[PDB]
Design a binder for this molecule. Structure first.
Ligand SMILES: [Mg+2]
Ligand SMILES: [Zn+2]
Ligand SMILES: [Zn+2]
Ligand SMILES: [Zn+2]
Ligand SMILES: [Zn+2]
Ligand SMILES: [Zn+2]
Lengths: 171, 83, 141, 47, 54, 157, 484, 137, 73
C-alpha cells in the first residue's frame, strides 16, 4: 500500500564536508541514501518530496570521531504492505512452490498452497507459469492478490499473499 | 529548553573546559582534513592550527550549556570571550 | 552446522595460511603482508596459573560440608540430604574403587603414576561379562 | 545478514547498539543470573 | 551507591524496588563507559551554521 | 491487518513535523504515480536549477529522463513506477480530482477509500469480498453507482 | 576490528532495575538446560541441552555460537534457562519475604490494617517507598488477625501466624500453636493473590517487580562467557565454579523430579527439595551467615556470584571503577636538573613501545611516510598502519610488501616522540596533582627522569619509587592533557 | 450429535459457547471453531465425510429453526420470495387467479421445495432463471 | 520447513525470506542446506488419535457429568 508520510532522520556528516556548503551534501546524502530503501518500520521510501522545506535544524559533534550529526525531518512516499487487503501486480519470476509477483518494488510471493486448489502447478509452462481452466497465469500476467502475511526484518520486507477466493487469480 | 538569546544569563566568558573541548574537537576535525578557516602560516600541528583559529575567532562551533533543570543556553565560540 | 572458524589473509589467500601469533601483542598476522587477522588474544597460561575428567567424566561433584556460620541442626542434614542419590550412580563402585586402589597402591608404597593407570585400568573396563563381578578384587588386583 | 530480533518481545525493529566496557556487560549478565533485570534504555522517561 | 560499600544488597533492593537509575552521576557513567557530564563533558558542542557562510 | 489495524506509525491519528494532527494520507494506485512525477519533475526543474549555477511509449523516456535526475539505483523505484504506469487507472489529475472530489464524501477510513479508488472493481459484491472491511460501510448501491461512474472514469489507453 | 552493524548507535540514558518474571526468562531463554553433563557423552564437543550447549554462546575462538554468529568476540553469550521442579526462595529476599508475609493475611492475600487505620492514613502518606514498607511493616507486623470492619473493609477472619527465619526456612506458628514450617508454594500462591494496589503501596511495581517474583521458579543459566572454562593442557580444561554449582543444582533438581514421579516418602522429599533450595542459595551467595559453607573438592568455598562483586577485586571496584589499561609504562624514576619543569625523560626503549595513532593529512603525509620506512625498530619509527577501512598492518612482517602507500585518513601508529603530552602519575595518588601531564623527551637508559621541583606534588623521591605513564590515544584527549 | 460438532464432537456441555453454523451449499451442523479453521484459508471442501462441496466462509450463515427441510424450503422460498416476490396476487387481484398465481408460485416453489425429484425444479430453475428474467420481465 | 542437517525447524515466512531467484527452493543459513516440510503427517495423525481419546470420555464421564449437571448436587 502507498502512503505519504512525515519522517525524520539522523545522518552523520563526516568532518571533511564541513565547508560553507555542508547543507548541500546533507540533502545529497539524504536522497542518495534514503530513496529506494526498505525499512521494517515504514517500508520502501520512494520519493523524497518537498525537497525545499526539509527541517535540518542543528548538528551535534559526536565526542569522539568529531563528526557532525543532524536530525532531519521530511516528507516522502512509501509502499507499505499489510495483511488482509487485495493488491494487484504482474508476476515476474516463478518456482515450483509458486511464483514471485512483482508489486511496487516488493516482489511479493504468492504460494499455490494459499491460492485456489484447482490450479496445481502444471509445470509444463515454458517460460514457467501456471495453467488453470479459468485462466492461464503467465509471467507478465496481471494478478490480484490479497496479502496474507508480511515480515519486516529491518531494511527488508517479505510478505505473503493468496488468491484463493473470487475476484482473485488472474486479471 | 532553548533559553532565548536575549535572556541568556550565564557567564559571557569561556570556561577552561570549554576552551579545552573546543580545541580538542576542532583539532580532531582538522586532523580529518576538515576545511580550515585560516591561513596555516606554516603550521602543521592540528592543535596549533586550532589554537590559531580560536585566536581569530574563526571556529564555527557553538557551545550548548545545559542548566541543571534541563534547559540550555547557546553561545557560539565566536562570541564568548577567551580570558 | 560445522561451527568452525579458520583464518586466512583475504588479501593474500594463497594458502592454508602462513600466519603467526604475536602473543605479546595479542594479534595474529599474515606472515606475508602483515595484515593482522584477529586481535584481543586471550591469555593461555595465566588462565591455569590461578589454579579428574579422565575418571570423573561429566557427572560433576563438589565437596559439601559445614561452614563457620552454621549450627549442627543444619550441618548434619547436609550430611542427611547428600545421601539420597548414591545408588542412581554406580559411581560409589567407581570412586570407592579408586579410593580403595588409592588406599592400596599408596599403602603398597608405589609411584603415584601407577595409581593413575589403575585408576584408569578400572575405569576403562569397569563392567564386562568377563568382569561380571568376579569379586571386584581381581581387577583391583 | 543484517537481521536482529529480540524474541521474547518479538521485536525485530526497535534495536540499538551501544558501546560499553565488557566488564559491565559482564556485570549485567551476572545481575541477570541472580534474577535482577538491569534494563538499559537509551532515552529518558522521567525527563 | 552500589559502588561504595555493600554492593549486592544494594543491588537487590534496587531490583526489588524497581529503582530507576537515571545515569547522571559520574559513577554511573563510568560503568557504562560513557562521557560523564563532568568538566569538559558538561555541555555539548554544536556545529554552528550561520558562521559557516565563509 | 485486514480489520483496519495498521501500524502505530500509520495510526489514523497521524502527526506532521509541526505537531498538529492531520489526516493519514493514503493514495489511489495511480495518482500516487502522478504526485511522484510531479515531484521528480519539480526536482527536474530544481535539480537542474542548481545545475545551471499511447503514453506507454513515452512513459519510459519520461521515467528514465527523470532517472538521471535521481540516484539511478531506482529502476526499482521504477519497478513501482513501471508498475504504477502498467497498473495506472487514471490520468489528468481532475480525473482523480473529480474522483477524489467524488470519493471523499465517503465517510470511510482512508485505507478503504484509497483502496476502492486503487482497485479495478467491476462488481459491488467485489468489495464485500475483496476488502472485507467493506461489507457494511457502503452498500452495493452507493458502491456500484460510483463503480459505474468509475467504469467510465476508468480512462484507458 | 569489530564488524559493521546497522542498528542505530545510541548511548544509555537510564537503567530500570527490577526483578525477573519467570515467563520472561522462558521467553528469553534459547535453550532448556537439562543434563548436568558439560561435554558430549562421547568425550567430544558438547552435550546439547547440556550445561553449555552450543546454542548458548561459544568460546574456543574457533566456533560460531550457532545461535548468533561466529565471533567469540562478538557473541555476548545467549541466556538459557532451567525450570525448577518446585519453587524456592531467592536468598536476597528471604528477609524481604518474612517481612512481607507479616504484612498481609496469609489466607486471602489482603493486607492487614489499612487506611481505615489512622496511621495507615499516615503511612501511605510517605512518598518514599523503602520507608513506606518500613513504617507499614511496623504497624502490620504485630497485629495478628485478618479483621473485617471497624467503621468510623476486607475480612478473611484468620489469625495470622508468627514467622521466623531459620536457614532458608520460614516457619509460621498460629495460636488458635501450629509450628508448621511454611511451604514456599503457599507463599508463592499467597503472593500471586495480592492486589496491585496493595503491593504497589507495599513498595513494589507491577511492571518491574511483583512480589511473587522473589520466589524462584525458573532459573536463568548464564552463558559460558560468564563462567568460562580454562582449557588447559588438552585435558585440564578446568571448569568454573558457576558451572559446578549449576551442575550441582541441576542434579539436585533432576533427582527431586523423580522422587515425586517415583514414590513419596514425604520426608525424604521434604529434605530433597530443601537440599536443592540450599544449592540455589549458595549459588547466588555462598557467604551466607547462619548456614554451611558450600565447599569445593579442594575444600575451599565456592566462588558464589555475590563473591564476584563483593569488595575490591569485584566487578565494581576492581573492574569497572578501575581496571588495567593499555598504552602505559612504569619504571623507576630519577632526577634531572636539566629538564624543564614539564618534561619527562622517557627511555628510548619505552618510547619504542608505546605508540600513538596519527591520521595522515596533507600536513604530515611525507613525514609519516618517512617513519613507516624506519619501521618498528629504529626509534622515530612506527609499528602499524591502519587503513581507513578499519584494517591494520604490522610493519614488521611487511618488509615483504616493502614499500607502502599512505593515503589521507589512514592512521599510522608512530612511536611517541618528543613533546607528545603524556600523563604521569605516582601512586597512591590522593590528590589531583598526583597526575599531571608532561611532555616527552626521549633519553637513554631506563628510568623516567623528571625535574626536581615537580617532585613535591607527586610526593616522590628517588630511592626506587616508580611512577606510571599513560599515553593519550586521540587527538582530543591530547588537548585535554595539554590544556587542563 | 444434537449439540456437539459433527467434526470435533465438542459437546455444548463441554463448550457451552459453541455456536453452530451451516452453509447454503450443504447445511452442515458444525461448530464455528472448525468453520474459521476450515475457511480462514479459503475456498475448499466442506469438512464432512462425503461432502466435496467447495464452499466459502462468507457464504456461511446461521440456522433459525433447525429444520433444514423447512429452512432450505424457507431458503427456496427466500430465493423465491426474493425474485418470485415478483408474483402477482395483489398485483393480480382475481381471487381465483390470486389464489392460482399464489398456487402457481407455490407450485413453482413446492417444485423446488418438495425437492424429491427437483429437476422440473431445475426446469423451474430455468424458469427461475427465466424468473430472474421474469422478475426482470 | 526444517533443515535436518541442523535439525532445526523453520516456517514459511522464513523460507520466502530465505528464498532466492536462483534457488527456487530453500537453503539453511545455518547449514546452507535444503529444507524439508514438517507436521504434515504426524500431528494430523496424532490429533485424530487423541480425538478418539477425547471421544473415549464422551459416552464416559462427560455424558455422566452432564448427568450430574441435571441437578448439580
Ligand atoms: Mg621513596
Ligand atoms: Zn596477507
Ligand atoms: Zn552468540
Ligand atoms: Zn485474609
Ligand atoms: Zn467442530
Ligand atoms: Zn541446517
Amino acid at each position: 500500500m502507498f502512503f505519504i508520510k512525515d519522517l525524520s532522520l539522523n545522518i552523520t556528516l563526516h568532518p571533511s564536508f564541513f565547508g560553507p556548503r555542508m547543507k548541500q551534501y546533507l540533502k545529497t546524502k539524504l536522497l542518495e541514501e534514503v530513496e529506494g530503501s526498505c525499512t521494517g518500520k515504514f517500508g520502501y521510501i520512494l520519493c523524497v518530496l518537498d525537497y525545499d522545506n526539509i527541517d535540518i535544524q542543528r548538528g551535534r559533534i559526536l565526542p569522539t570521531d568529531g563528526s557532525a550529526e543532524f536530525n532531519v525531518k521530511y516528507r516522502a512516499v512509501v509502499f507499505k504492505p499489510f495483511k488482509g487487503e487485495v493488491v494487484d501486480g504482474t508476476v515476474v519470476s516463478c518456482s515450483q512452490h509458486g511464483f514471485e509477483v512483482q508489486v511496487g518494488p516488493m516482489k511479493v510471493f504468492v504460494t499455490k498452497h494459499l491460492m485456489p486448489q484447482d490450479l496445481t502447478f502444471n509445470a509444463g509452462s515454458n517460460p514457467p507459469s501456471y495453467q488453470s481452466s479459468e485462466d492461464v497465469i503467465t509471467i507478465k500476467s496481471r494478478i490480484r492478490v490479497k496479502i496474507e502475511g508480511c515480515i519486516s526484518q529491518v531494511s527488508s520486507i517479505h510478505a505473503i499473499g493468496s488468491i484463493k477466493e473470487d475476484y482473485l487469480g488472474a486479471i | 529548553k532553548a533559553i532565548p538569546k536575549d535572556q541568556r544569563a550565564t557567564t559571557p566568558y569561556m570556561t577552561k573546559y570549554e576552551r579545552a573541548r573546543i580545541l580538542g574537537t576542532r583539532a580532531l576535525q582538522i586532523s580529518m582534513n576538515a576545511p580550515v578557516f585560516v591561513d596555516l602560516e606554516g603550521e602543521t600541528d592540528p592543535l596549533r592550527i586550532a589554537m590559531k583559529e580560536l585566536a581569530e575567532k574563526k571556529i564555527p562551533l557553538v557551545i550548548r550549556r545545559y542548566l541543571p533543570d534541563g534547559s540550555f543556553e547557546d553561545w557560539s565560540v565566536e562570541e564568548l570571550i577567551v580570558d | 552446522p560445522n561451527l568452525n572458524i579458520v583464518l586466512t589473509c583475504p588479501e593474500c589467500k594463497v594458502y592454508p595460511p602462513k600466519i603467526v601469533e604475536r602473543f605479546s601483542e595479542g594479534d595474529v598476522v599474515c606472515a606475508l603482508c602483515g595484515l593482522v587477522l584477529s586481535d584481543k588474544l586471550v591469555d593461555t597460561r595465566s588462565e591455569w596459573r590461578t589454579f579428574n575428567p579422565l575418571l570423573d567424566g561429566n557427572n560433576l561433584s563438589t565437596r559439601i560440608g559445614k561452614g563457620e556460620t552454621t549450627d549442627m541442626r543444619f550441618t548434619k542434614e547436609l550430611n542427611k540430604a547428600q545421601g539420597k542419590n548414591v545408588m542412581d550412580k554406580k559411581d560409589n563402585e567407581v570412586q570407592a574403587a579408586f579410593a580403595k586402589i588409592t588406599m592400596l597402591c599408596d599403602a603398597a608404597e608405589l609411584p603415584k603414576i601407577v595409581k593413575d593407570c589403575a585408576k584408569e585400568a578400572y575405569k576403562l573396563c569397569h563392567d564386562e561379562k568377563t568382569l561380571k563381578g568376579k569379586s571386584m578384587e581381581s581387577i583391583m588386583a | 545478514h543484517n537481521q536482529f530480533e529480540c524474541k521474547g518481545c518479538d521485536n525485530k525493529i526497535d534495536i540499538y547498539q551501544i558501546h560499553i566496557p565488557y566488564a559491565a556487560k559482564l556485570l549485567f549478565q551476572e545481575l541477570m543470573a541472580m534474577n535482577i533485570t538491569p534494563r538499559l534504555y537509551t532515552d529518558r522517561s522521567r525527563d | 551507591r552500589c559502588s561504595f560499600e555493600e554492593t549486592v544488597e544494594i543491588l537487590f533492593e534496587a531490583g526489588a524496588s524497581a529503582e530507576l537509575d537515571d545515569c547522571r552521576g559520574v559513577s554511573e557513567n563510568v560503568i557504562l563507559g560513557q562521557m560523564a557530564p563532568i568538566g569538559t563533558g558538561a555541555f555539548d558542542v554544536m556545529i554552528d551554521e550561520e558562521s559557516l557562510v565563509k | 491487518a485486514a480489520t483496519l489495524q495498521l501500524g502505530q506509525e500509520f495510526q489514523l491519528k497521524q502527526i506532521n513535523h509541526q505537531g498538529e494532527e492531520e489526516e493519514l494520507i493514503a493514495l489511489n494506485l495511480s495518482e500516487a504515480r502522478l504526485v511522484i512525477k510531479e515531484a521528480l519533475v519539480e526536482r527536474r526543474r530544481a535539480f537542474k536549477r542548481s545545475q545551471k549555477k499511447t503514453r506507454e511509449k513515452e512513459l519510459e523516456s519520461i521515467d528514465v529522463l527523470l532517472e538521471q535526475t535521481t540516484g539511478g539505483n531506482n529502476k526499482d523505484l521504477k519497478n513501482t513506477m513501471q508498475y504504477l504506469t502498467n497498473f495506472s487507472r487514471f490520468r489528468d489529475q481532475e480525473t482523480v480530482g473529480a474522483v477524489i472530489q467524488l470519493l471523499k464524501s465517503t465517510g470511510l477510513h482512508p485505507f478503504e477509500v484509497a483502496q476502492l479508488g486503487s482497485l479495478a472493481c467491476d462488481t459491488a459484491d467485489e468489495a464485500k469480498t475483496l476488502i472485507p472491511s467493506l461489507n457494511n460501510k457502503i452498500s452495493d448501491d452507493e458502491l456500484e453507482r460510483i463503480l459505474k461512474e468509475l467504469s467510465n472514469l476508468e480512462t484507458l489507453y | 576490528g569489530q564488524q559493521y552493524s546497522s542498528a542505530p548507535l545510541r548511548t544509555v540514558k537510564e537503567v530500570q532495575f527490577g526483578l525477573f518474571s519467570p515467563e520472561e526468562v522462558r521467553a528469553i531463554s534459547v535453550a532448556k538446560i537439562r543434563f548436568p553433563e558439560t561435554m558430549d557423552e562421547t568425550q567430544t564437543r558438547a552435550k546439547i541441552g547440556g550445561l553449555n550447549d552450543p546454542r548458548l554462546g561459544s568460546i574456543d575462538r574457533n566456533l560460531k555460537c550457532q545461535t548468533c554468529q561466529e565471533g567469540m568476540n562478538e557473541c555476548p553469550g545467549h541466556f538459557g534457562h532451567i525450570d525448577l521442579a518446585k519453587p524456592v526462595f531467592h536468598v536476597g529476599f528471604i528477609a524481604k519475604i518474612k517481612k512481607v508475609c507479616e504484612c498481609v493475611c496469609m489466607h486471602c492475600g489482603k493486607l492487614l490494617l489499612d487506611e481505615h487505620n489512622e496511621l495507615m492514613r499516615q503511612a501511605l502518606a510517605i512518598k518514599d517507598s523503602k520507608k513506606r514498607f518500613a513504617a507499614i511493616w511496623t504497624l502490620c507486623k504485630t497485629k495478628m488477625v485478618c479483621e473485617t470492619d471497624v467503621p468510623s473493609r476486607g475480612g478473611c477472619g484468620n489469625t495470622q501466624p508468627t514467622i521466623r527465619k531459620d536457614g532458608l526456612k520460614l516457619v509460621g506458628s498460629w495460636k488458635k500453636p501450629e509450628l508448621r514450617v511454611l511451604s514456599t508454594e503457599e507463599i508463592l500462591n499467597i503472593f500471586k493473590h495480592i492486589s496491585v494496589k496493595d503491593f504497589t503501596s507495599l513498595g513494589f511495581n507491577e511492571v518491574f517487580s511483583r512480589p511473587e517474583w522473589m520466589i524462584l521458579t525458573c532459573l536463568p543459566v548464564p552463558p559460558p562467557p560468564v563462567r568460562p572454562s580454562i582449557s588447559f593442557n588438552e585435558s585440564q580444561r578446568g571448569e568454573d565454579d558457576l558451572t559446578f554449582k549449576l551442575a550441582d543444582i541441576l542434579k539436585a533438581n533432576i533427582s527431586l523430579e523423580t522422587l515425586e514421579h517415583n514414590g513419596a516418602p514425604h520426608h525424604a522429599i521434604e529434605e530433597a527439595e530443601s537440599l536443592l533450595q540450599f544449592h540455589v542459595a549458595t549459588y547466588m551467595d555462598n557467604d551466607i551467615a547462619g548456614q554451611p559453607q558450600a565447599l569445593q573438592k579442594s575444600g575451599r568455598p565456592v566462588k558464589s556470584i555475590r563473591a564476584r562483586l563483593k569488595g575490591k577485586e569485584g566487578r565494581i571496584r576492581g573492574n569497572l571503577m578501575g581496571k588495567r589499561v593499555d598504552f602505559s609504562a612504569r619504571t623507576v624514576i630519577s632526577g634531572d636538573p636539566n629538564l624543564e619543569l614539564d618534561q619527562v625523560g622517557v627511555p628510548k626503549s619505552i618510547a619504542k613501545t608505546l605508540t600513538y595513532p596519527e591520521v595522515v593529512t596533507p600536513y604530515n603525509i611525507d613525514r609519516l611516510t618517512q617513519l613507516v620506512r624506519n619501521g618498528p625498530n629504529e626509534h622515530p619509527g612506527a609499528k602499524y598502519v591502519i587503513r581507513d577501512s578499519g584494517d591494520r598492518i604490522d610493519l614488521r612482517y611487511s618488509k615483504r610488501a616493502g614499500d607502502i602507500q599512505l593515503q589521507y585518513g589512514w592512521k599510522v601508529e608512530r612511536h611517541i616522540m618528543d613533546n607528545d603530552p603524556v600523563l604521569f602519575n605516582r601512586q597512591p595518588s590522593l590528590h589531583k596533582m598526583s597526575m599531571m601531564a608532561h611532555r616527552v623527551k626521549v633519553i637513554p637508559y631506563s628510568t623516567f627522569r623528571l625535574n626536581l621541583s615537580v617532585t613535591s606534588p607527586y610526593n616522590a623521591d628517588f630511592d626506587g619509587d616508580e611512577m606510571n605513564l599513560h599515553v593519550p590515544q586521540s587527538e582530543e584527549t591530547r588537548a585535554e592533557l595539554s590544556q587542563l | 450429535n444434537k449439540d456437539m460438532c459433527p467434526i470435533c464432537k465438542t459437546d455444548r456441555y463441554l463448550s457451552p459457547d459453541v455456536k453452530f453454523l451451516v452453509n447454503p451449499e450443504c447445511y452442515h451442523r458444525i461448530c464455528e471453531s472448525c468453520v474459521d479453521r476450515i475457511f480462514s484459508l479459503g475456498p475448499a471442501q466442506c469438512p464432512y465425510k462425503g461432502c466435496d462441496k467447495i464452499l466459502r466462509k462468507n457464504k456461511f450463515k446461521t440456522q433459525i429453526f433447525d429444520d433444514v427441510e423447512v429452512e432450505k424450503e424457507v431458503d427456496i422460498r427466500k430465493r423465491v420470495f426474493n425474485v418470485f416476490n415478483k408474483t402477482i396476487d395483489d398485483f393480480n387481484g382475481d381471487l381465483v387467479e390470486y389464489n392460482k398465481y399464489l398456487e402457481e408460485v407455490e407450485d413453482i416453489i413446492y417444485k423446488l421445495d418438495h425437492g424429491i425429484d427437483v429437476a422440473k425444479t431445475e426446469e423451474k430453475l430455468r424458469t427461475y432463471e427465466e424468473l430472474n428474467k421474469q422478475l426482470i420481465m | 520447513y526444517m533443515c535436518p542437517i541442523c535439525l532445526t525447524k523453520y516456517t514459511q515466512l522464513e523460507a520466502v525470506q530465505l528464498l532466492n531467484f536462483d534457488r527456487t527452493e530453500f537453503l539453511c543459513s545455518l547449514c546452507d542446506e535444503p529444507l524439508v516440510e514438517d507436521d504434515s503427517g504426524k500431528k494430523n495423525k496424532e490429533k485424530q488419535d487423541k480425538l478418539n481419546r477425547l471421544m473415549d470420555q464422551i459416552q464416559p464421564i462427560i455424558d455422566s457429568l452432564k448427568k450430574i449437571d441435571d441437578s448439580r448436587i
